[PDB]
Amino acid sequence: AVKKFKPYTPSRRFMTVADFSEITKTEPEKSLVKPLKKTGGRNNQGRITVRFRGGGHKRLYRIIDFKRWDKVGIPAKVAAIEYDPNRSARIALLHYVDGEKRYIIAPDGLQVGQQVVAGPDAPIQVGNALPLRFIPVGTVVHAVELEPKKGAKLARAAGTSAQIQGREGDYVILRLPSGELRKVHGECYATVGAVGNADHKNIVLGKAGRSRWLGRRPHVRGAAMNPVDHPHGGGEGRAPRGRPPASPWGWQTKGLKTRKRRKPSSRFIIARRKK
Amino acid sequence: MKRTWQPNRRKRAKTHGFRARMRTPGGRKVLKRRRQKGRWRLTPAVRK
RNA sequence: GAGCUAGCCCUGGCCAGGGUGAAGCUGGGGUGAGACCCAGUGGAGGCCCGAACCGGUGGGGGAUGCAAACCCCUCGGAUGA
RNA sequence: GAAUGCCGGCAUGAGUAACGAUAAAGAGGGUGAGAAUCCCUCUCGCCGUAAGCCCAAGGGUUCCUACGCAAUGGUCGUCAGCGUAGGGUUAGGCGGGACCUAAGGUGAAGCCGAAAGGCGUAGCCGAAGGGCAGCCGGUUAAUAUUCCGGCCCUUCCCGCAGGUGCGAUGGGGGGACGCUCUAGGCUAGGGGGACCGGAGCCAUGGACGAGCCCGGCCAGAAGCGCAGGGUGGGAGGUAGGCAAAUCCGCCUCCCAACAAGCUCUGCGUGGUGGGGAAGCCCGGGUGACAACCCCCCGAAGCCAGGGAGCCAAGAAAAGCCUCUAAGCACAACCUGCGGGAACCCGUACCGCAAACCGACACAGGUGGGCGGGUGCAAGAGCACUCAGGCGCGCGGGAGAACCCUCGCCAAGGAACUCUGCAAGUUGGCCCCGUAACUUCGGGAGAAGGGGUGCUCCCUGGGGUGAUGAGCCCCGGGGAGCCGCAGUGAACAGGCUCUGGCGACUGUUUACCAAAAACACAGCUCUCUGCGAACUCGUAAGAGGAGGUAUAGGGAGCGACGCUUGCCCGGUGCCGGAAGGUCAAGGGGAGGGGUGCAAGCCCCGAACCGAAGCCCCGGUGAACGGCGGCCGUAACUAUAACGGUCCUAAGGUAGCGAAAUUCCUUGUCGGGUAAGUUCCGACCUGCACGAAAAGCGUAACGACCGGAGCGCUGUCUCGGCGAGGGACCCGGUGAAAUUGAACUGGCCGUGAAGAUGCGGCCUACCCGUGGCAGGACGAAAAGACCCCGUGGAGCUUUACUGCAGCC
RNA sequence: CGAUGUCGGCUCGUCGCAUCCUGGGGCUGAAGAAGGUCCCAAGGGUUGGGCUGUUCGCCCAUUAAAGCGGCACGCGAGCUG
RNA sequence: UGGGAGAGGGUGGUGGAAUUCCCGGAGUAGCGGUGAAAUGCGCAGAUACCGGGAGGAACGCCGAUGGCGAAGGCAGCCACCUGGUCCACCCGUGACGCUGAGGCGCGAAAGCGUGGGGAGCAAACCGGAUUAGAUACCCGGGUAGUCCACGCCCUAAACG
RNA sequence: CCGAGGGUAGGGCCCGUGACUGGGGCGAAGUCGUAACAAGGUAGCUGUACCGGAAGGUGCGGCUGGAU
Ligand SMILES: CC[C@H]1OC(=O)[C@H](C)[C@@H](O[C@H]2C[C@@](C)(OC)[C@@H](O)[C@H](C)O2)[C@H](C)[C@@H](O[C@@H]2O[C@H](C)C[C@H](N(C)C)[C@H]2O)[C@](C)(O)C[C@@H](C)C(=O)[C@H](C)[C@@H](O)[C@]1(C)O
Ligand SMILES: [Mg+2]
Ligand SMILES: [Mg+2]
Ligand SMILES: [Mg+2]
Ligand SMILES: [Mg+2]
Ligand SMILES: [Mg+2]
Ligand SMILES: [Mg+2]
Ligand SMILES: [Mg+2]
Ligand SMILES: [Mg+2]
Ligand SMILES: [Mg+2]
Ligand SMILES: [Mg+2]
Ligand SMILES: [Mg+2]
Ligand SMILES: [Mg+2]
Ligand SMILES: [Mg+2]
Ligand SMILES: [Mg+2]
Ligand SMILES: [Mg+2]
Ligand SMILES: [Mg+2]
Ligand SMILES: [Mg+2]
Ligand SMILES: [Mg+2]
Ligand SMILES: [Mg+2]
Ligand SMILES: [Mg+2]
Ligand SMILES: [Mg+2]
Ligand SMILES: [Mg+2]
Ligand SMILES: [Mg+2]
Ligand SMILES: [Mg+2]
Ligand SMILES: [Mg+2]
Ligand SMILES: [Mg+2]
Ligand SMILES: [Mg+2]
Ligand SMILES: [Mg+2]
Ligand SMILES: [Mg+2]
Ligand SMILES: [Mg+2]
Ligand SMILES: [Mg+2]
Ligand SMILES: [Mg+2]
Ligand SMILES: [Mg+2]
Ligand SMILES: [Mg+2]
Ligand SMILES: [Mg+2]
Ligand SMILES: [Mg+2]
Ligand SMILES: [Mg+2]
Ligand SMILES: [Mg+2]
Ligand SMILES: [Mg+2]
Ligand SMILES: [Mg+2]
Ligand SMILES: [Mg+2]
Ligand SMILES: [Mg+2]
Ligand SMILES: [Mg+2]
Ligand SMILES: [Mg+2]
Ligand SMILES: [Mg+2]
Ligand SMILES: [Mg+2]
Ligand SMILES: [Mg+2]
Ligand SMILES: [Mg+2]
Ligand SMILES: [Mg+2]
Ligand SMILES: [Mg+2]
Ligand SMILES: [Mg+2]
Ligand SMILES: [Mg+2]
Ligand SMILES: [Mg+2]
Ligand SMILES: [Mg+2]
Ligand SMILES: [Mg+2]
Ligand SMILES: [Mg+2]
Ligand SMILES: [Mg+2]
Ligand SMILES: [Mg+2]
Ligand SMILES: [Mg+2]
Ligand SMILES: [Mg+2]
Ligand SMILES: [Mg+2]
Ligand SMILES: [Mg+2]
Ligand SMILES: [Mg+2]
Ligand SMILES: [Mg+2]
Ligand SMILES: [Mg+2]
Ligand SMILES: [Mg+2]
Ligand SMILES: [Mg+2]
Ligand SMILES: [Mg+2]
Ligand SMILES: [Mg+2]
Ligand SMILES: [Mg+2]
Ligand SMILES: [Mg+2]
Ligand SMILES: [Mg+2]
Ligand SMILES: [Mg+2]
Ligand SMILES: [Mg+2]
Ligand SMILES: [Mg+2]
Ligand SMILES: [Mg+2]
Ligand SMILES: [Mg+2]
Ligand SMILES: [Mg+2]
Ligand SMILES: [Mg+2]
Ligand SMILES: [Mg+2]
Ligand SMILES: [Mg+2]
Ligand SMILES: [Mg+2]
Ligand SMILES: [Mg+2]
Ligand SMILES: [Mg+2]
Ligand SMILES: [Mg+2]
Ligand SMILES: [Mg+2]
Ligand SMILES: [Mg+2]
Ligand SMILES: [Mg+2]
Ligand SMILES: [Mg+2]
Ligand SMILES: [Mg+2]
Ligand SMILES: [Mg+2]
Ligand SMILES: [Mg+2]
Ligand SMILES: [Mg+2]
Ligand SMILES: [Mg+2]
Ligand SMILES: [Mg+2]
Ligand SMILES: [Mg+2]
Ligand SMILES: [Mg+2]
Ligand SMILES: [Mg+2]
Ligand SMILES: [Mg+2]
Ligand SMILES: [Mg+2]
Ligand SMILES: [Mg+2]
Ligand SMILES: [Mg+2]
Ligand SMILES: [Mg+2]
Ligand SMILES: [Mg+2]
Ligand SMILES: [Mg+2]
Ligand SMILES: [Mg+2]
Ligand SMILES: [Mg+2]
Ligand SMILES: [Mg+2]
Ligand SMILES: [Mg+2]
Ligand SMILES: [Mg+2]
Ligand SMILES: [Mg+2]
Ligand SMILES: [Mg+2]
Ligand SMILES: [Mg+2]
Ligand SMILES: [Mg+2]
Ligand SMILES: [Mg+2]
Ligand SMILES: [Mg+2]
Ligand SMILES: [Mg+2]
Ligand SMILES: [Mg+2]
Ligand SMILES: [Mg+2]
Ligand SMILES: [Mg+2]
Ligand SMILES: [Mg+2]
Ligand SMILES: [Mg+2]
Ligand SMILES: [Mg+2]
Ligand SMILES: [Mg+2]
Ligand SMILES: [Mg+2]
Ligand SMILES: [Mg+2]
Ligand SMILES: [Mg+2]
Ligand SMILES: [Mg+2]
Ligand SMILES: [Mg+2]
Ligand SMILES: [Mg+2]
Ligand SMILES: [Mg+2]
Ligand SMILES: [Mg+2]
Ligand SMILES: [Mg+2]
Ligand SMILES: [Mg+2]
Ligand SMILES: [Mg+2]
Ligand SMILES: [Mg+2]
Ligand SMILES: [Mg+2]
Ligand SMILES: [Mg+2]
Ligand SMILES: [Mg+2]
Ligand SMILES: [Mg+2]
Ligand SMILES: [Mg+2]
Ligand SMILES: [Mg+2]
Ligand SMILES: [Mg+2]
Ligand SMILES: [Mg+2]
Ligand SMILES: [Mg+2]
Ligand SMILES: [Mg+2]
Ligand SMILES: [Mg+2]
Ligand SMILES: [Mg+2]
Ligand SMILES: [Mg+2]
Ligand SMILES: [Mg+2]
Ligand SMILES: [Mg+2]
Ligand SMILES: [Mg+2]
Ligand SMILES: [Mg+2]
Ligand SMILES: [Mg+2]
Ligand SMILES: [Mg+2]
Ligand SMILES: [Mg+2]
Ligand SMILES: [Mg+2]
Ligand SMILES: [Mg+2]
Ligand SMILES: [Mg+2]
Ligand SMILES: [Mg+2]
Ligand SMILES: [Mg+2]
Ligand SMILES: [Mg+2]
Ligand SMILES: [Mg+2]
Ligand SMILES: [Mg+2]
Ligand SMILES: [Mg+2]
Ligand SMILES: [Mg+2]
Ligand SMILES: [Mg+2]
Ligand SMILES: [Mg+2]
Ligand SMILES: [Mg+2]
Ligand SMILES: [Mg+2]
Ligand SMILES: [Mg+2]
Ligand SMILES: [Mg+2]
Ligand SMILES: [Mg+2]
Ligand SMILES: [Mg+2]
Ligand SMILES: [Mg+2]
Ligand SMILES: [Mg+2]
Ligand SMILES: [Mg+2]
Ligand SMILES: [Mg+2]
Ligand SMILES: [Mg+2]
Ligand SMILES: [Mg+2]
Ligand SMILES: [Mg+2]
Ligand SMILES: [Mg+2]
Ligand SMILES: [Mg+2]
Ligand SMILES: [Mg+2]
Ligand SMILES: [Mg+2]
Ligand SMILES: [Mg+2]
Ligand SMILES: [Mg+2]
Ligand SMILES: [Mg+2]
Ligand SMILES: [Mg+2]
Ligand SMILES: [Mg+2]
Ligand SMILES: [Mg+2]
Ligand SMILES: [Mg+2]
Ligand SMILES: [Mg+2]
Ligand SMILES: [Mg+2]
Ligand SMILES: [Mg+2]
Ligand SMILES: [Mg+2]
Ligand SMILES: [Mg+2]
Ligand SMILES: [Mg+2]
Ligand SMILES: [Mg+2]
Ligand SMILES: [Mg+2]
Ligand SMILES: [Mg+2]
Ligand SMILES: [Mg+2]
Ligand SMILES: [Mg+2]
Ligand SMILES: [Mg+2]
Ligand SMILES: [Mg+2]
Ligand SMILES: [Mg+2]
Ligand SMILES: [Mg+2]
Ligand SMILES: [Mg+2]
Ligand SMILES: [Mg+2]
Ligand SMILES: [Mg+2]
Ligand SMILES: [Mg+2]
Ligand SMILES: [Mg+2]
Ligand SMILES: [Mg+2]
Ligand SMILES: [Mg+2]
Ligand SMILES: [Mg+2]
Ligand SMILES: [Mg+2]
Ligand SMILES: [Mg+2]
Ligand SMILES: [Mg+2]
Ligand SMILES: [Mg+2]
Ligand SMILES: [Mg+2]
Ligand SMILES: [Mg+2]
Ligand SMILES: [Mg+2]
Ligand SMILES: [Mg+2]
Ligand SMILES: [Mg+2]
Ligand SMILES: [Mg+2]
Ligand SMILES: [Mg+2]
Ligand SMILES: [Mg+2]
Ligand SMILES: [Mg+2]
Ligand SMILES: [Mg+2]
Ligand SMILES: [Mg+2]
Ligand SMILES: [Mg+2]
Ligand SMILES: [Mg+2]
Ligand SMILES: [Mg+2]
Ligand SMILES: [Mg+2]
Ligand SMILES: [Mg+2]
Ligand SMILES: [Mg+2]
Ligand SMILES: [Mg+2]
Ligand SMILES: [Mg+2]
Ligand SMILES: [Mg+2]
Ligand SMILES: [Mg+2]
Ligand SMILES: [Mg+2]
Ligand SMILES: [Mg+2]
Ligand SMILES: [Mg+2]
Ligand SMILES: [Mg+2]
Ligand SMILES: [Mg+2]
Ligand SMILES: [Mg+2]
Ligand SMILES: [Mg+2]
Ligand SMILES: [Mg+2]
Ligand SMILES: [Mg+2]
């Protein structure tokens, strides 16, 4: 439920923020958090290997549980639901009757104080983790493992999901958030339901500084640079691209596919993406 | 205005000091050369 | 060689005073319930005025200078990128 | 003898410019060979959110004392941050270490790279972050939370007693956190007192007074008092916290619940130790048995880890508490008391500056805290002052031009000029009032005006206190007084109308451009299924991201509104197992060299044979492109209509002499007495146009235009005045430049612009203050231009190659 | 080319005369007045404005008239920019 | 009070045909399209045939001169939340009624905003053909839209 | 004190006029086409959307004031 403001500043005209109504706890679990190193897009060599990054809000990284087969058959209770700044999605705190506490990501409609579970015999119920094969065909599902027991990889960001089209042997046919049809092992754990906070994309950042809060440093076009800096640099006055539109490093950025065409996982990709 | 020299004893020793030279191959050859020329001091003096 | 300078990282510090009065909350009206209206409370904001601080618009001086970029008068930002 | 040669010495300009903020000086008395310059007093001026005081960087004896003045000091010097010598820095409690972690650094394991070396989990290092136990006064010429005095606390060792399952680098808790706003109650600090203590003082017309002047506190252990913080107690189950675990986490039950109890903080008091003014007198002595009280203001600091709300969601680790594991329970741990033990390093001095950074005793730069009073609405603003500190290391005169900084101005009022450039104007507070337009916020402090002091009387409400007084904070009414003037000084918008460009706040060419440029939220295209794409790297490894398509890279555009048309022939990209072209490799028809021969050796066609190209499509918010001629209407004119060649397709809406229009000051209209600019239109648009976006857009702008009002020294057109210079005198004393010079005008001549040649003319010798026409004046071996088979940056369907990718 | 600063403006002039005005003349298709044209004459004079960087030019209002040229398109060790 | 009909409205589900697209099988020289034809698609293996797969939309027969709503309008099928209405009985209140300026609400299509979605259809646009021309009628493509959610628009041959 | 009115500043409504621009009405015999009345030669009309020299064409839904 995105929030509008009255236009009492030039930048409050369109700026929108999340509702935070599904939030029930306003501080993290001191046991499930750890320091988060702001890299600033600079690798171990020190050099900027991802441009235009840095200077955002300090955050604490909450440990998220992407391998839910760790605790099979132990009913955890949905303790609270908390803001996580390292994600688009929200996170739910779970109190396993084991006594262990864990953060999962909150699917849609999941309510505080409900029992969730994981395992082959789990119910098909929002928030439960079964191997892919044991989920009935035709059910939206988030937090999918790609390869078995390597971690939940697909369908994680806000509002995303993944449908199961059918089965075919040791593999199921998943329709990814991007409309791709990939085959994923049936023994791959997944969580039933779409990720919550779907209203996330409607957020209008509203002003430049808000992007600066998020660690996004200003982007400078190539057409504004000099030939020493960019294919698009130079020109007297303005100038069209004057060549195939290109990145700073030379390769063409309009249409040029870059997926490796000998990659092994191609054997498991039925159909490249939609739209 | 703010000139370029802004002395900082910790900066001085950790950049041009003896132990910073002996670590790298170049800084060793710096020491060899100055020890060959006959310099009185091979490293910048700073009273710490 | 990043003790100048550009950015980023970690850890601290700094921003007189005054103005405007957002949502919300309360009460009243309203309605089938509402939207909503009004009032008070409230104290939002790359909000407004203006020191420190950060700047450097216009003019004058300076031009073997006080100074290898300075001085005076004006002027911009000043809870924020 | 010449290389704008090299090194050095000495000249010239020259007794010239200058002697470093215009805060400012004067006299007396000392000292001494010598005094504007040092010492002392008196008087005057300057800073006072500093030009004062206290930390930290950095500097490194510059600190104090004696003795000096060659040089350093822009003059002088007896003086000094200068020379010579002597002296000076005292810690269990301040800061750092023997404690902890942060980025980063390093790095057993492990990984990688010709070598060198590069990484890398732990671990280690790393601080202005965490943790941690001293406050006040006195003393030295110079150090003091360090020596001393008073009253306090910490650790380690050993011991006695009491108590307990003791026990850790292991498990747990805690440490532990953001921005904005903010409650209660304190203190820091300050204002007043008619209360208390005090050397005194009565002036010059009055006052011997509730007169004036001065001061009226600081530190403190246990206990107690006020104000807050922290925190439930019990038991049952227990599979989780990588062994265990009575702790922690989860579940049930019991009672406690806004409390209370306990624990810890701050503030108050407190045994006690201190401090203690002006004035007078020679830092000290007095004062003085000094007094040490009451009321008020009151923090941004304390209680503190308080409270609220918000989104962008806010270090770590140790100390400390708890749980237990080996081990051990003659030990070991907790508590209380006693005795003993307690190391290394810093401590002088400067510190918005004459000691730091600027080659200088350089108007510049330099992080943190304290920063007193009154008035002006507030305040760290502004003026004046306390404490404190200064008068800026050349002076004395004179009273020209001219320069700077400043004041005023008759009539005019932008006529100045590229331009109101500059300088006026306006100026804060309260009340009245306030337009088109708009995104309903705004535009807006729109505009325009009224008020403002001092005295008297009447009065409303608040804070404290107690409900009163008293101080204190907001006011309201009536009547008066004075001046030219009542924010009477200082600090403090000129306004309006209309265009262009960019939505906006923001960013930029450090040192000529702050803009219309960059950025920006927002729209689109494209890429990317995660060991992602992409980037850095030889690699390992990093980033991306401990992210997962509502996500990440790249690119164009640039809030918002209404919109973005036609062309796929070329170029890019994407799709296409056919076809054709194609490399090594396969095949080996068929020949060749040799040899007695077996054989060895070489050439070798058809055919099989990738990617890439060819070829078939697609595709524009991919690179891009979007015609010409001829004719036609019942007045002329112009062509809705036709005709034809060409195209891949012939510019759509909307705009338009425009940041674009050459002809151009286009033509018409407005504004003006007059308008190459400006605004509105027209349209044969040299040469607009739709995300290198098209047409609008409220708001915004130190952007660029036009106009008007107000007001002016901008001007007609200049005058006077002030101070700092120029000028004269004493002191100190540069510079660039310079072939040598005994260095006139005209008219000619000359390498074509002559002080230097010819002819004529003029002219006694040397200066000083001035002005700049010349010495093709100085400065920089022309930046333009050319030249060189000179250089470099950038580009591409130039050549060639390399990485990368296929 | 081991540098001769480049338009215009301002300031300050100075010279030429092929004279815009003032003075003197002849001819006139000169009645007067007022014009045309030529001759003599450089003594003095030769305005203030709107527009544009402009010189120039147009325009407003005057005027006796609103002259044309040279002086390195006179003059940046005189200013402006 | 007890009963009844119905595509009335809203929500949530779900079922079969059909077309398009993708995959396999089989198969070969044309399919398509019209007044005729050309475009277009097909030896790179189309069309016609079988199986599998995904997806959207719409509900054949019943079906009617039918039924409901105040109108716009409403049609597979099941369930839930819900309106209107009629009939029996003659039980209850006792004129409590009718109309309705303003007000408020509803209001087909198309269109607009933000999201999703997209099979068929199809303004715009492209091409073939017709034609003097053909910015058309015919044919082959084709974008918005048509669908969903929410939020506007509020017009109509909104008619009996 | 009030006060005619004078002055300054900003509003509101009306009238007249304005380069140019928008359609409108009219006008004996203009140019282009043929949309409509017959099934008007694509049944018409409609609200809307979009396009086009022009009448109009088409998508969507609606009406019969539509023919056999
Ligand atoms: C402040 C102090 C500086 O003076 C200036 O800036 C003036 C204002 C320059 O004009 C500036 C400004 C400007 C507009 O001059 C009017 C322009 O000409 C150029 C850009 O230089 C001068 C004089 C230039 O001379 C000019 O050289 C020109 C190439 C041609 C001309 N010559 C023919 C005579 C001559 O005057 C030139 C080169 O800078 C001189 C050289 C030696 C310098 O660099 C010297 C050291 C200067 O930096 C300076 C003296 O310190
Ligand atoms: Mg909003
Ligand atoms: Mg609003
Ligand atoms: Mg939420
Ligand atoms: Mg932790
Ligand atoms: Mg990271
Ligand atoms: Mg590293
Ligand atoms: Mg990058
Ligand atoms: Mg970056
Ligand atoms: Mg995310
Ligand atoms: Mg979240
Ligand atoms: Mg798999
Ligand atoms: Mg967005
Ligand atoms: Mg961004
Ligand atoms: Mg962030
Ligand atoms: Mg950009
Ligand atoms: Mg550029
Ligand atoms: Mg550029
Ligand atoms: Mg570079
Ligand atoms: Mg390049
Ligand atoms: Mg380019
Ligand atoms: Mg450019
Ligand atoms: Mg260009
Ligand atoms: Mg450019
Ligand atoms: Mg640009
Ligand atoms: Mg382009
Ligand atoms: Mg181009
Ligand atoms: Mg390219
Ligand atoms: Mg690449
Ligand atoms: Mg895909
Ligand atoms: Mg600097
Ligand atoms: Mg520094
Ligand atoms: Mg240091
Ligand atoms: Mg350092
Ligand atoms: Mg180093
Ligand atoms: Mg070192
Ligand atoms: Mg080596
Ligand atoms: Mg070695
Ligand atoms: Mg030696
Ligand atoms: Mg060295
Ligand atoms: Mg630096
Ligand atoms: Mg501030
Ligand atoms: Mg402020
Ligand atoms: Mg105010
Ligand atoms: Mg609230
Ligand atoms: Mg505020
Ligand atoms: Mg301001
Ligand atoms: Mg300046
Ligand atoms: Mg600066
Ligand atoms: Mg200079
Ligand atoms: Mg200055
Ligand atoms: Mg100033
Ligand atoms: Mg300022
Ligand atoms: Mg010689
Ligand atoms: Mg030489
Ligand atoms: Mg030499
Ligand atoms: Mg020499
Ligand atoms: Mg000499
Ligand atoms: Mg000599
Ligand atoms: Mg001399
Ligand atoms: Mg001289
Ligand atoms: Mg000088
Ligand atoms: Mg001086
Ligand atoms: Mg000064
Ligand atoms: Mg003296
Ligand atoms: Mg002397
Ligand atoms: Mg003295
Ligand atoms: Mg003060
Ligand atoms: Mg030094
Ligand atoms: Mg001396
Ligand atoms: Mg001397
Ligand atoms: Mg002497
Ligand atoms: Mg001596
Ligand atoms: Mg000096
Ligand atoms: Mg002496
Ligand atoms: Mg030791
Ligand atoms: Mg450590
Ligand atoms: Mg290393
Ligand atoms: Mg280190
Ligand atoms: Mg520390
Ligand atoms: Mg300590
Ligand atoms: Mg002390
Ligand atoms: Mg103490
Ligand atoms: Mg004992
Ligand atoms: Mg115990
Ligand atoms: Mg124990
Ligand atoms: Mg422990
Ligand atoms: Mg934390
Ligand atoms: Mg901290
Ligand atoms: Mg915040
Ligand atoms: Mg408080
Ligand atoms: Mg105290
Ligand atoms: Mg006070
Ligand atoms: Mg006494
Ligand atoms: Mg007397
Ligand atoms: Mg257990
Ligand atoms: Mg005594
Ligand atoms: Mg503070
Ligand atoms: Mg605190
Ligand atoms: Mg750590
Ligand atoms: Mg024993
Ligand atoms: Mg030791
Ligand atoms: Mg010691
Ligand atoms: Mg000391
Ligand atoms: Mg200063
Ligand atoms: Mg300071
Ligand atoms: Mg000093
Ligand atoms: Mg210097
Ligand atoms: Mg230096
Ligand atoms: Mg000095
Ligand atoms: Mg200084
Ligand atoms: Mg004081
Ligand atoms: Mg006083
Ligand atoms: Mg004030
Ligand atoms: Mg003093
Ligand atoms: Mg004189
Ligand atoms: Mg004299
Ligand atoms: Mg001054
Ligand atoms: Mg005055
Ligand atoms: Mg005047
Ligand atoms: Mg006037
Ligand atoms: Mg003017
Ligand atoms: Mg003038
Ligand atoms: Mg200008
Ligand atoms: Mg003024
Ligand atoms: Mg108006
Ligand atoms: Mg208004
Ligand atoms: Mg206006
Ligand atoms: Mg407007
Ligand atoms: Mg409004
Ligand atoms: Mg204001
Ligand atoms: Mg106002
Ligand atoms: Mg006003
Ligand atoms: Mg009054
Ligand atoms: Mg008075
Ligand atoms: Mg003022
Ligand atoms: Mg102001
Ligand atoms: Mg214009
Ligand atoms: Mg710009
Ligand atoms: Mg801007
Ligand atoms: Mg714009
Ligand atoms: Mg805009
Ligand atoms: Mg700002
Ligand atoms: Mg820039
Ligand atoms: Mg610059
Ligand atoms: Mg520059
Ligand atoms: Mg520079
Ligand atoms: Mg430079
Ligand atoms: Mg400048
Ligand atoms: Mg610029
Ligand atoms: Mg600016
Ligand atoms: Mg922008
Ligand atoms: Mg947009
Ligand atoms: Mg998009
Ligand atoms: Mg990571
Ligand atoms: Mg991106
Ligand atoms: Mg924009
Ligand atoms: Mg609009
Ligand atoms: Mg093309
Ligand atoms: Mg093509
Ligand atoms: Mg193409
Ligand atoms: Mg074939
Ligand atoms: Mg091939
Ligand atoms: Mg386009
Ligand atoms: Mg092109
Ligand atoms: Mg082309
Ligand atoms: Mg005819
Ligand atoms: Mg269009
Ligand atoms: Mg035009
Ligand atoms: Mg014009
Ligand atoms: Mg235009
Ligand atoms: Mg043009
Ligand atoms: Mg023109
Ligand atoms: Mg004209
Ligand atoms: Mg006119
Ligand atoms: Mg115009
Ligand atoms: Mg024309
Ligand atoms: Mg253009
Ligand atoms: Mg374009
Ligand atoms: Mg363009
Ligand atoms: Mg605009
Ligand atoms: Mg700006
Ligand atoms: Mg600006
Ligand atoms: Mg102007
Ligand atoms: Mg004006
Ligand atoms: Mg004016
Ligand atoms: Mg003057
Ligand atoms: Mg004077
Ligand atoms: Mg004399
Ligand atoms: Mg002398
Ligand atoms: Mg001297
Ligand atoms: Mg001679
Ligand atoms: Mg002579
Ligand atoms: Mg000649
Ligand atoms: Mg000559
Ligand atoms: Mg001569
Ligand atoms: Mg001769
Ligand atoms: Mg001669
Ligand atoms: Mg002279
Ligand atoms: Mg001269
Ligand atoms: Mg001159
Ligand atoms: Mg000269
Ligand atoms: Mg010369
Ligand atoms: Mg000269
Ligand atoms: Mg010269
Ligand atoms: Mg020279
Ligand atoms: Mg040169
Ligand atoms: Mg040279
Ligand atoms: Mg040369
Ligand atoms: Mg040349
Ligand atoms: Mg050469
Ligand atoms: Mg050559
Ligand atoms: Mg050549
Ligand atoms: Mg060359
Ligand atoms: Mg080169
Ligand atoms: Mg190579
Ligand atoms: Mg030359
Ligand atoms: Mg020379
Ligand atoms: Mg005459
Ligand atoms: Mg006559
Ligand atoms: Mg006559
Ligand atoms: Mg004659
Ligand atoms: Mg004359
Ligand atoms: Mg004139
Ligand atoms: Mg002119
Ligand atoms: Mg002209
Ligand atoms: Mg006359
Ligand atoms: Mg002339
Ligand atoms: Mg000449
Ligand atoms: Mg000249
Ligand atoms: Mg000339
Ligand atoms: Mg010329
Ligand atoms: Mg000239
Ligand atoms: Mg000049
Ligand atoms: Mg000039
Ligand atoms: Mg000149
Ligand atoms: Mg074929
Ligand atoms: Mg589909
Ligand atoms: Mg009855
Ligand atoms: Mg009714
Ligand atoms: Mg519809
Ligand atoms: Mg066609
Ligand atoms: Mg035909
Ligand atoms: Mg079709
Ligand atoms: Mg409707
Ligand atoms: Mg009908
Ligand atoms: Mg009158
Ligand atoms: Mg017809
Ligand atoms: Mg027909
Ligand atoms: Mg059509």
UniProtKB/Swiss-Prot annotation, chain A:
Keywords, in A-Z order: Ribonucleoprotein, Ribosomal protein, RNA-binding, rRNA-binding
Ranges annotated as biased composition (Basic residues): 256-275
GO cellular component assignments: large ribosomal subunit
Encoding gene (name): rplB
Cited InterPro entries: NA-bd_OB-fold, Rib_uL2_dom2, Ribosomal_uL2, Ribosomal_uL2_bac/org-type, Ribosomal_uL2_C, Ribosomal_uL2_CS, Ribosomal_uL2_dom3, Ribosomal_uL2_RNA-bd_dom
Species, as recorded: Thermus thermophilus (strain ATCC 27634 / DSM 579 / HB8)
Name of the featured protein: Large ribosomal subunit protein uL2
Keyword Membrane (UniProt): no
Job of this protein: One of the primary rRNA binding proteins. Required for association of the 30S and 50S subunits to form the 70S ribosome, for tRNA binding and peptide bond formation. It has been suggested to have peptidyltransferase activity; this is somewhat controversial. Makes several contacts with the 16S rRNA (forming bridge B7b) in the 70S ribosome.
From Swiss-Prot, chain B:
InterPro entries the record matches: Ribosomal_bL34, Ribosomal_bL34_CS
Residues in the signal sequence: none
Record family assignment: Belongs to the bacterial ribosomal protein bL34 family.
NCBIfam families xref list: rpmH_bact
Function: Found on the solvent side of the large subunit.
PANTHER family the record matches: LARGE RIBOSOMAL SUBUNIT PROTEIN BL34M, MITOCHONDRIAL RIBOSOMAL PROTEIN 34 FAMILY MEMBER
Name of protein: Large ribosomal subunit protein bL34
Taxonomic lineage from the root: Bacteria, Thermotogati, Deinococcota, Deinococci, Thermales
